[model samples]
Target chain A: APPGVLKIFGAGLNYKSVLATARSTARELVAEALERYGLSSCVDAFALCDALGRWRAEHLRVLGDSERPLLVQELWRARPGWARRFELRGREEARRLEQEA
Target chain B: PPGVLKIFGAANYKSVLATARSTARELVAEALERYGLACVDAFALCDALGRPWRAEHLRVLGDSERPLLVQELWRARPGWARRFELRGREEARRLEQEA
Candidate 1:
């Protein structure tokens, strides 16, 4: 429940061979989120990365705690807005989910 | 096709239909340019072609516009011969040759 603790997803996914699956699912969610948020022109890559991570977490409901964080975090560091939005909102969502669990 | 067609409307729909085949060809060609055409031989064509669908998965679906091209292309590749168990070696090879 600690804030800023990265939530996890997709333990069964075999990224070793099937990054295509993850990429497909990630693209679908990212495109939808961009349209939903109306951030197409101004959307940060970090935000999309966060959105992709969040979608997998929300949809897949499994935990692959070891995957994709480095990339997501790198994106956050590269984009200040994403660092604030994702770090704060992502932490809050994770905390809320832990409370439900 | 109609289901998706409804989402785009007539002019847009026609445009999609018009470009889809050529676009797919370009997509495949770009992949080939980067990874080389050996994807047809790779046992994991999905991985090799940078696509989400797999040949073995499509093989059982059998000879549809969607699966036929993907499956036979994977079958034709020389990459991983062991993974070609999709439709019996003979049929897979024949499909690759003839499809």
Candidate 2:
């Protein structure tokens, strides 16, 4: 909340293994607070990390109205390393969901 | 792809601003169906005309990633900026390879 990815985003997300150790305390504190709240902090590190493979996924879904999809699309010039892993991961999960159908 | 920036991983892309649009769409449409590519969250991507939509909760979105990029590239601290830019550029090169 203070700034950067430091806010405690619920308790379901706890552990994260960044290739490098550089996470804001606010984020960590958010986790701690979640613990205090007795929320589930357990998260699949791989899935979580893979979830982060893309940058602007969250933005589009939230603020990007269909009218301005073009502008919203411009802001995020897909980073080179994103092998669509985030999309793939999400898709794979969805596929599982589809299996029930 | 019309106005959006294109990586063009699938086909021909040269040193050119997009005067022409690409015919291809995302190879994997379903994956992107869930996460709006532009808006970070579904809440954020709402119709300005339709009942004004709300911004979605962007959790630790920039803290680790772009914050580092901007802090180095845009802000670039007094001394570290130079070195940081180099590092960022290097990281960028690696990014192209990683994906």
Candidate 3:
């Protein structure tokens, strides 16, 4: 067996591997969201946020509140320029819209 | 420029240094307790964004000690473990110098 497989068996649970998998999955989700809604305008940003929010709701039990912020930060850092233009602003705007609703 | 002002500056520096040293000591102690001193040659603290911010090497007990090769993330805490491998001696040296 491979070292990674052996390590999982030896350690009972390989948290490192688990975390790596989560990060990889998050990247894929973010990439798909970006592809569907390009990071261009406020409308596009809102659509992307809605897509991510739906994903978060679906995985709420696993993600929890603390993990959500970290995942958001990770996505922001991945595309710093685009995040600056839309991601952060979109989140704030979305929150305000939610409050108004 | 006043002598009394210099005293305040010196006192502030001393307090900050003391706090920093105490925090490092606490982290080192925690790492040792979790991972045996023999198992961990060095450890690093990551930032809020999960990037390594600081690192320190524990005392080397033998020449045969290999660098920590696997990076581990802790779910319960805000820290991660990075173990350099023996094959990556140059990277280890750079990290050591960074510490």
Candidate 4:
């Protein structure tokens, strides 16, 4: 909120809650599908948690306005204060978005 | 805890999973405008969960290291055994990580 100050915030994410939201369904789907296909013995040691994390993030991303920009520090540090240009691009895109809206 | 050892944890450093996971939302809305893209089989002796034969086998590669050469190893080898969380917001984008 100044000439060129970068913003940062801590990400609050609980794995179990997120995991449950993301994984349970995929496990049920893929597991049963594999079962129905006679590959049930491949009943995994556990459901893949990656799929779960993804589902959780996406499910919670329904908060449109609250979705914030994630800046890569290495990129931004290397390029130094490009958020203005980034915002310029955002503004133009905003016009198009609102037009489509 | 009878016998659960080092795990096959999450890992995504601009690698394969990025290709596997894409959405209709993206492929249509953007990417296709920029680059034409179109797009595996078979497996043998799978899983890091393979039986530990417990044989001391070692091989040395004489490939000369050019100073800044980086060797990527599994994150589980990160030498501080604790519960490391996966896919939390470190770099905005998601990374598959395992502990």
Candidate with maximal TM-score: 2
Question: What is the DockQ of the complex in model 1?
Answer: 0.01
- CA error at residue A48 for candidate 2, angstroms: 8.2
TM-score of chain B of 4: 0.15
- lDDT of model 1 at residue A93? 42
What's the residue-level lDDT of A100 in candidate 4? 22
Best by lDDT: 1
Report the number of backbone clashes for model 4. Answer: 4
Q: Model 1, which residues run further than 4 Å from truth?
A: A1-49, A52-71, A75-101, B1-29, B34-99
Interface RMSD of each: 18.9, 16.0, 16.0, 15.8
Candidate 1, TM-score vs. the true structure? 0.18
Query: Please, what are the lDDT tens digits per residue for candidate 3 over residues A1-101?
Result: 11111000011111111122322333333334443433423333322221122202211011111122233322222211121111312434444433221
Q: Please report how far candidate 1 places residue A6 from its true position, in Å.
A: 4.6
Residue pairs with backbone atoms closer than 3 Å in model 4 (clashes): B10-B96, B10-B97, B10-B98, B11-B96
Docking class of 4: incorrect
Worst 10 residues of 1 chain B by lDDT: B2-11
TM-score of every candidate: 0.18, 0.21, 0.18, 0.16
**Scored by Cα lDDT, where does model 3 land?**
0.24
TM-scores for chain B, in order?
0.21, 0.14, 0.22, 0.15
- Model 1: per-residue Cα lDDT over A1-101, one tens digit each: 11122322212111111122211333333334344433443222312222222123321011122223322322122212221112212333433432221
lDDT of 2 by residue, B15-68 (tens): 212212111122112223422343212211101111112212111111113222
Real interface contacts reproduced by model 2, as a fraction: 0.00
Worst 10 residues of 3 chain B by lDDT: B2-11
